[PDB]
């Protein structure tokens, strides 16, 4: 038999873990590998070090049928070692299970490794409170058995279905928040069911790699030496999280840049309501779609160091380079952060959030509040902050 390893993820955090897995096994130059990581282009000069390495696109959270052509190149008995995004696991595995169904004499599933997308999974699990979780699990197990057999996907509970793979295959889950599973009383039947099949995401894997593997990993994830050096200064560090625009009663994008500068001043200036201290070196993490707003902010906040948007907070955590403090405009990204690193999260106006009270009801904010990761006082509504000038700095 031949093992083929498939790395599938439309998002970021599962791919970062899967690229770490690849790096840990990167002395094996010929192990068949299929990469379907929509957000990560593996550089040519890595690809050409490997044989039997293949690439598939994802569409609508499934590998395209081009996957079948690759698997057809392995005519013997093949075992699939599959890495997946938990939230998207059902769609991602569908063409794999379709291929298995068609080649049942030679294709088997060796094991699954599944990784959180992010706050998604937790926001979705919260919607299942008050259900009979034991009964939801058992029904999903039966519907998965039908899926693996007849090929008909229908889950009464798509959220719980993400967690019943052990009923069919060997599986390991890698969770952003094991505390959630262990402290959400309503999920105790699921926590017990998952048994030894889950662990916390391994944020220190990078530190155990050889120096050459560390460099390899940084190349895989697009974390170049310029940005890395900028984050190794022996000083306290604060990252401001930028946004795009919000409901400010104007379409003028410059207004939203100026207002984000005002929010930044409340962290950087002693006069600010959110003052972090004069001893922090300031960084800016623009929203990936901020575009020219990010240029406006960088230009008018002179002493700030830009962190490009492709460098996620998780890859900073994966490499041990998270700053000491993070604050600014809110996003579900904050769910991934250690509690000690979160300063203040500022909510802007939209359809669902028009006040601090609304912000406290935000779905990921609610999970974080239950887990004790933030206090309500760390949640700020944007227009509660007065206009504040910058400094000569």
């Amino acid at each position: 038999m031949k093992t083929i390893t498939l790395y599938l993820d439309p998002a970021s955090l599962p791919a970062l873990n899967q690229l770490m897995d690849f790096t840990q096994n990167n002395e094996d130059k010929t192990h068949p590998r299929i990469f379907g990581l929509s957000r990560f282009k593996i550089p040519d000069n890595i690809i050409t070090q490997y044989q039997n390495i293949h690439f598939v696109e994802l569409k609508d959270n499934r590998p395209t049928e081009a996957l079948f052509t690759i698997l057809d190149q392995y005519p013997g008995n093949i075992e699939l070692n599959i890495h997946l995004n938990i939230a998207h696991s059902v769609q991602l595995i569908r063409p794999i299970l379709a291929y298995r169904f068609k080649h049942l004499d030679r294709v088997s599933i060796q094991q699954l490794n599944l990784y959180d997308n992010g706050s998604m999974e937790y926001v979705d699990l919260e919607k299942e409170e008050n259900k009979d979780i034991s009964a939801e699990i058992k029904q999903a197990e039966k519907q998965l058995s039908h899926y693996l057999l007849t090929g008909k996907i229908k889950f009464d509970n798509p959220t719980i279905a993400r967690y019943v793979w052990q009923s069919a295959f060997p599986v390991k889950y890698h969770f952003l928040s094991t505390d959630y599973f262990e402290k959400a009383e309503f999920l105790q039947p699921l926590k017990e069911y998952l048994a030894e099949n889950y662990q916390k995401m391994d944020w220190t894997a990078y530190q155990q790699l050889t120096p050459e593997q560390q460099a390899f990993y940084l190349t895989l994830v697009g974390f170049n030496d310029e940005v890395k050096q900028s984050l190794e200064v022996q000083q306290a560090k604060f990252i401001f999280t930028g946004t795009t625009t919000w409901e400010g009663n104007t379409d003028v994008r410059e207004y939203y840049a100026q207002q984000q500068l005002n929010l930044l001043n409340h962290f950087t200036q002693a006069e600010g309501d959110l003052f972090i201290g004069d001893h922090y070196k300031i960084y800016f993490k623009g929203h990936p779609r901020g575009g020219e707003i990010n240029d406006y902010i960088l230009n008018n906040a002179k002493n700030i160091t830009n962190i490009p948007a492709n460098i996620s907070f998780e890859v900073l955590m994966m490499t041990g380079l998270l700053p000491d403090k993070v604050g600014g405009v809110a996003s579900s990204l904050y769910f991934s952060l250690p509690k000690e690193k979160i300063s203040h999260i500022i909510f802007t106006s939209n359809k669902q959030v028009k006040s601090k009270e609304d912000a406290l009801n935000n779905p990921y904010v609610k999970v974080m509040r239950r887990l004790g990761i933030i206090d309500e006082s760390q949640v700020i509504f944007w227009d509660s902050l007065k206009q504040l000038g910058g400094g000569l700095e």
Side-chain angles (χ1 to χ4, degrees), residues 73-89:
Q73 307 174 27
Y74 297 88
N77 257 37
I78 52 176
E79 310 202 346
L80 309 182
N81 181 308
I82 304 160
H83 299 246
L84 303 171
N85 173 312
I86 288 166
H88 297 296
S89 53

Side-chain angles (χ1 to χ4, degrees), residues 75-101 103-147 150-151 153-193:
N77 257 37
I78 52 176
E79 310 202 346
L80 309 182
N81 181 308
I82 304 160
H83 299 246
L84 303 171
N85 173 312
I86 288 166
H88 297 296
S89 53
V90 170
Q91 293 300 305
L92 284 167
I93 207 174
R94 189 195 198 280
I96 300 171
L97 294 186
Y99 191 87
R100 189 188 130 292
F101 169 79
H103 304 98
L104 183 63
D105 84 291
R106 68 197 206 77
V107 179
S108 62
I109 307 307
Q110 198 183 72
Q111 48 177 324
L112 309 186
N113 271 268
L114 301 93
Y115 317 81
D116 281 325
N117 190 101
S119 62
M120 193 175 288
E121 282 88 348
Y122 299 87
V123 167
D124 289 348
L125 278 163
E126 285 291 279
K127 309 183 208 293
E128 306 298 318
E129 183 155 25
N130 300 320
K131 294 199 214 184
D132 183 331
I133 301 302
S134 166
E136 305 287 328
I137 288 163
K138 290 181 189 301
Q139 183 66 280
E141 284 183 316
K142 297 181 181 76
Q143 293 179 321
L144 174 55
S145 180
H146 182 106
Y147 173 29
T150 72
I153 289 170
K154 175 57 199 274
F155 287 105
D156 291 352
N157 193 325
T159 294
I160 294 293
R162 299 164 174 175
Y163 300 98
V164 301
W165 300 104
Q166 72 193 53
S167 63
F169 318 118
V171 298
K172 330 182 47 53
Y173 297 84
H174 309 261
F175 290 151
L176 258 184
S177 183
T178 54
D179 280 344
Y180 178 82
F181 286 87
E182 294 162 7
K183 297 180 181 180
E185 265 199 73
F186 81 98
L187 281 179
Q188 285 327 265
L190 181 61
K191 193 264 285 188
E192 142 194 345
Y193 167 83

